[PDB]
Amino acid sequence: MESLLEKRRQLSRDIGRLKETYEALLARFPNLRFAYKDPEKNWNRNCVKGLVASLISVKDTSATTALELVAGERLYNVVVDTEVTGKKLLERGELKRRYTIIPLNKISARCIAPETLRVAQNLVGPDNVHVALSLVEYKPELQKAMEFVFGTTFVCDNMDNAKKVAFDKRIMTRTVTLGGDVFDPHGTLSGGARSQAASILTKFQELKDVQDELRIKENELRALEEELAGLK
Amino acid sequence: FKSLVHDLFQKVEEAKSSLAMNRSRGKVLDAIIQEKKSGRIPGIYGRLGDLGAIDEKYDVAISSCCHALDYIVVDSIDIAQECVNFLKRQNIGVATFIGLDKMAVWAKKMTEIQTPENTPRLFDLVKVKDEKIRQAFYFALRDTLVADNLDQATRVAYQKDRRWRVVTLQGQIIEQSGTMTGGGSKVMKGRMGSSL
């Protein structure tokens, strides 16, 4: 019984510490935060999943900069359940800045075909070309959003291979290099001098780890408190 | 209240980010234009937005939905690669370049169309001299529609037999993908070269 009471004190302490860390991080990087006012009474906060970058984890950290540029602005896109939710958010959510919302029920994208990756692999070598989506981990319920952000672009090792893959007539697919050069088969190239400072993705990850541990402890404590209440 | 404090952090951060990104964009463009003027890099035109004009009524719309207005038009991807190398070697910054030769695929694709609720197609509102540049604008804008408000946008985007890309006069966007863009007090404007 006292062990349960001590466990409750321990969980409460960790939760307090984690919330403080969470708030410190948001203060240091306010772009990591997405806030909105409930657009309705009895608002199900589960309808809003959050910023794309808060919902993924990089599998291959050598591709961190490439993945950052694959997404671009879409790291800060907001994933929600429906376009209905999205409209309410835009209208009634009191957003403090401009956001692009991804509605899971409507979002649509042409994923890279297996045959297309095949061709790219034979063209530049399977070590040197990957579908961006294969390099991020995320919960399955977010599949359609992540296909949209990462499933339509290749990540290649260097500019020469990226160019060869992007503009191959059998492929015609957006490609990004490890250095963050972006080839669009429509006929554009984006690149230049990029900072070697830590990718914003590392900061999202650092915040995600805190959010994840916080969620587990808050759930642990809620359950423990339910049962403590039951002793009476 | 902590949400009030963080709202202020966020606003401060947005101001800082806008300032920095606007200066960086201007710095990169001026560097590229010096390479054009000096003749050290041939085949550079300039930013796409300087090559078109649009009625002031649509200033916010096209400024909000056409990132390509800040792309730098050059003759080819080869010249784009020379520019990107230049930017890297002198640690100047980043830009997006349009290979104008790639734009020719749109040459016969620009004819006027019937649109949902007879909304204007934004591309048709852009006044251009050169036909190659007009092709670049079609690349940039395609069949983007202008709606009067977000309700009409949702109607023309989602509710027809087909999906359409639509921007509102206030600068909100619905993409063919399904995404919806808006929020905040900050308005994008002035990204087109004139108001002819």
PDB file of all heavy atoms in Angstrom, chain A residues 179-194:
ATOM      1  N   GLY A 179      22.669  15.964 -48.992  1.00  0.00           N
ATOM      2  CA  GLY A 179      23.045  17.336 -48.689  1.00  0.00           C
ATOM      3  C   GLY A 179      21.887  18.314 -48.785  1.00  0.00           C
ATOM      4  O   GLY A 179      22.024  19.497 -48.461  1.00  0.00           O
ATOM      5  N   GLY A 180      20.740  17.814 -49.226  1.00  0.00           N
ATOM      6  CA  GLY A 180      19.523  18.598 -49.267  1.00  0.00           C
ATOM      7  C   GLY A 180      19.265  19.303 -50.589  1.00  0.00           C
ATOM      8  O   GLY A 180      18.487  20.247 -50.631  1.00  0.00           O
ATOM      9  N   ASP A 181      19.894  18.841 -51.670  1.00  0.00           N
ATOM     10  CA  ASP A 181      19.579  19.381 -52.995  1.00  0.00           C
ATOM     11  C   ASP A 181      18.279  18.741 -53.484  1.00  0.00           C
ATOM     12  O   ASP A 181      18.096  17.534 -53.359  1.00  0.00           O
ATOM     13  CB  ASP A 181      20.716  19.126 -53.986  1.00  0.00           C
ATOM     14  CG  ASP A 181      22.058  19.597 -53.452  1.00  0.00           C
ATOM     15  OD1 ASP A 181      22.248  20.834 -53.335  1.00  0.00           O
ATOM     16  OD2 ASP A 181      22.903  18.731 -53.127  1.00  0.00           O
ATOM     17  N   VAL A 182      17.370  19.544 -54.027  1.00  0.00           N
ATOM     18  CA  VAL A 182      16.066  18.998 -54.410  1.00  0.00           C
ATOM     19  C   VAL A 182      15.848  19.119 -55.910  1.00  0.00           C
ATOM     20  O   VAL A 182      15.780  20.228 -56.426  1.00  0.00           O
ATOM     21  CB  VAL A 182      14.902  19.726 -53.703  1.00  0.00           C
ATOM     22  CG1 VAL A 182      13.552  19.109 -54.109  1.00  0.00           C
ATOM     23  CG2 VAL A 182      15.103  19.747 -52.155  1.00  0.00           C
ATOM     24  N   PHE A 183      15.719  17.986 -56.590  1.00  0.00           N
ATOM     25  CA  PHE A 183      15.352  17.990 -58.012  1.00  0.00           C
ATOM     26  C   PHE A 183      13.879  17.675 -58.188  1.00  0.00           C
ATOM     27  O   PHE A 183      13.386  16.658 -57.685  1.00  0.00           O
ATOM     28  CB  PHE A 183      16.168  16.975 -58.810  1.00  0.00           C
ATOM     29  CG  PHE A 183      17.587  17.375 -59.034  1.00  0.00           C
ATOM     30  CD1 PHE A 183      18.585  16.925 -58.189  1.00  0.00           C
ATOM     31  CD2 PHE A 183      17.934  18.186 -60.107  1.00  0.00           C
ATOM     32  CE1 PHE A 183      19.901  17.283 -58.397  1.00  0.00           C
ATOM     33  CE2 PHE A 183      19.255  18.538 -60.328  1.00  0.00           C
ATOM     34  CZ  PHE A 183      20.239  18.083 -59.470  1.00  0.00           C
ATOM     35  N   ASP A 184      13.171  18.547 -58.897  1.00  0.00           N
ATOM     36  CA  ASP A 184      11.785  18.263 -59.219  1.00  0.00           C
ATOM     37  C   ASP A 184      11.720  17.984 -60.707  1.00  0.00           C
ATOM     38  O   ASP A 184      12.174  18.792 -61.510  1.00  0.00           O
ATOM     39  CB  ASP A 184      10.864  19.417 -58.828  1.00  0.00           C
ATOM     40  CG  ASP A 184       9.395  19.063 -58.965  1.00  0.00           C
ATOM     41  OD1 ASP A 184       8.959  18.703 -60.089  1.00  0.00           O
ATOM     42  OD2 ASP A 184       8.682  19.132 -57.940  1.00  0.00           O
ATOM     43  N   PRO A 185      11.167  16.828 -61.076  1.00  0.00           N
ATOM     44  CA  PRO A 185      11.100  16.433 -62.485  1.00  0.00           C
ATOM     45  C   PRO A 185      10.324  17.426 -63.362  1.00  0.00           C
ATOM     46  O   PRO A 185      10.515  17.411 -64.580  1.00  0.00           O
ATOM     47  CB  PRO A 185      10.386  15.074 -62.425  1.00  0.00           C
ATOM     48  CG  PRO A 185       9.594  15.129 -61.175  1.00  0.00           C
ATOM     49  CD  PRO A 185      10.476  15.859 -60.207  1.00  0.00           C
ATOM     50  N   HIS A 186       9.480  18.276 -62.769  1.00  0.00           N
ATOM     51  CA  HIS A 186       8.807  19.339 -63.528  1.00  0.00           C
ATOM     52  C   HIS A 186       9.800  20.349 -64.098  1.00  0.00           C
ATOM     53  O   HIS A 186       9.462  21.123 -64.989  1.00  0.00           O
ATOM     54  CB  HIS A 186       7.803  20.103 -62.657  1.00  0.00           C
ATOM     55  CG  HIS A 186       6.549  19.348 -62.340  1.00  0.00           C
ATOM     56  ND1 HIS A 186       6.310  18.794 -61.102  1.00  0.00           N
ATOM     57  CD2 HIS A 186       5.451  19.090 -63.089  1.00  0.00           C
ATOM     58  CE1 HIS A 186       5.124  18.207 -61.107  1.00  0.00           C
ATOM     59  NE2 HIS A 186       4.584  18.373 -62.301  1.00  0.00           N
ATOM     60  N   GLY A 187      11.006  20.382 -63.544  1.00  0.00           N
ATOM     61  CA  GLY A 187      12.045  21.239 -64.071  1.00  0.00           C
ATOM     62  C   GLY A 187      12.593  22.282 -63.114  1.00  0.00           C
ATOM     63  O   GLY A 187      12.869  23.410 -63.525  1.00  0.00           O
ATOM     64  N   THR A 188      12.735  21.933 -61.834  1.00  0.00           N
ATOM     65  CA  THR A 188      13.360  22.853 -60.881  1.00  0.00           C
ATOM     66  C   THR A 188      14.491  22.177 -60.100  1.00  0.00           C
ATOM     67  O   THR A 188      14.538  20.959 -59.994  1.00  0.00           O
ATOM     68  CB  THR A 188      12.346  23.455 -59.850  1.00  0.00           C
ATOM     69  OG1 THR A 188      11.837  22.433 -58.985  1.00  0.00           O
ATOM     70  CG2 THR A 188      11.169  24.135 -60.564  1.00  0.00           C
ATOM     71  N   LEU A 189      15.380  23.004 -59.558  1.00  0.00           N
ATOM     72  CA  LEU A 189      16.425  22.578 -58.641  1.00  0.00           C
ATOM     73  C   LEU A 189      16.483  23.580 -57.501  1.00  0.00           C
ATOM     74  O   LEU A 189      16.499  24.788 -57.735  1.00  0.00           O
ATOM     75  CB  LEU A 189      17.772  22.477 -59.354  1.00  0.00           C
ATOM     76  CG  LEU A 189      18.989  22.286 -58.440  1.00  0.00           C
ATOM     77  CD1 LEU A 189      18.971  20.922 -57.742  1.00  0.00           C
ATOM     78  CD2 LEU A 189      20.282  22.506 -59.232  1.00  0.00           C
ATOM     79  N   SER A 190      16.459  23.080 -56.271  1.00  0.00           N
ATOM     80  CA  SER A 190      16.614  23.933 -55.106  1.00  0.00           C
ATOM     81  C   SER A 190      17.855  23.522 -54.346  1.00  0.00           C
ATOM     82  O   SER A 190      18.052  22.340 -54.061  1.00  0.00           O
ATOM     83  CB  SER A 190      15.418  23.844 -54.157  1.00  0.00           C
ATOM     84  OG  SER A 190      14.186  23.813 -54.844  1.00  0.00           O
ATOM     85  N   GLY A 191      18.676  24.490 -53.980  1.00  0.00           N
ATOM     86  CA  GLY A 191      19.844  24.159 -53.180  1.00  0.00           C
ATOM     87  C   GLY A 191      20.730  25.355 -52.959  1.00  0.00           C
ATOM     88  O   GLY A 191      20.390  26.480 -53.342  1.00  0.00           O
ATOM     89  N   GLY A 192      21.877  25.117 -52.328  1.00  0.00           N
ATOM     90  CA  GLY A 192      22.825  26.184 -52.045  1.00  0.00           C
ATOM     91  C   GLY A 192      23.484  25.915 -50.710  1.00  0.00           C
ATOM     92  O   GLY A 192      23.582  24.757 -50.291  1.00  0.00           O
ATOM     93  N   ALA A 193      23.924  26.982 -50.047  1.00  0.00           N
ATOM     94  CA  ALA A 193      24.603  26.883 -48.757  1.00  0.00           C
ATOM     95  C   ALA A 193      23.607  26.630 -47.629  1.00  0.00           C
ATOM     96  O   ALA A 193      22.739  27.454 -47.364  1.00  0.00           O
ATOM     97  CB  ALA A 193      25.396  28.156 -48.476  1.00  0.00           C
ATOM     98  N   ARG A 194      23.728  25.483 -46.975  1.00  0.00           N
ATOM     99  CA  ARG A 194      22.840  25.168 -45.860  1.00  0.00           C
ATOM    100  C   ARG A 194      23.646  25.091 -44.564  1.00  0.00           C
ATOM    101  O   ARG A 194      24.775  24.600 -44.554  1.00  0.00           O
ATOM    102  CB  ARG A 194      22.093  23.859 -46.101  1.00  0.00           C
ATOM    103  CG  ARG A 194      21.361  23.778 -47.459  1.00  0.00           C
ATOM    104  CD  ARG A 194      20.331  22.644 -47.466  1.00  0.00           C
ATOM    105  NE  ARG A 194      19.560  22.605 -48.708  1.00  0.00           N
ATOM    106  CZ  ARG A 194      18.428  23.265 -48.923  1.00  0.00           C
ATOM    107  NH1 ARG A 194      17.898  24.020 -47.972  1.00  0.00           N
ATOM    108  NH2 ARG A 194      17.819  23.153 -50.101  1.00  0.00           N
TER     109      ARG A 194
END
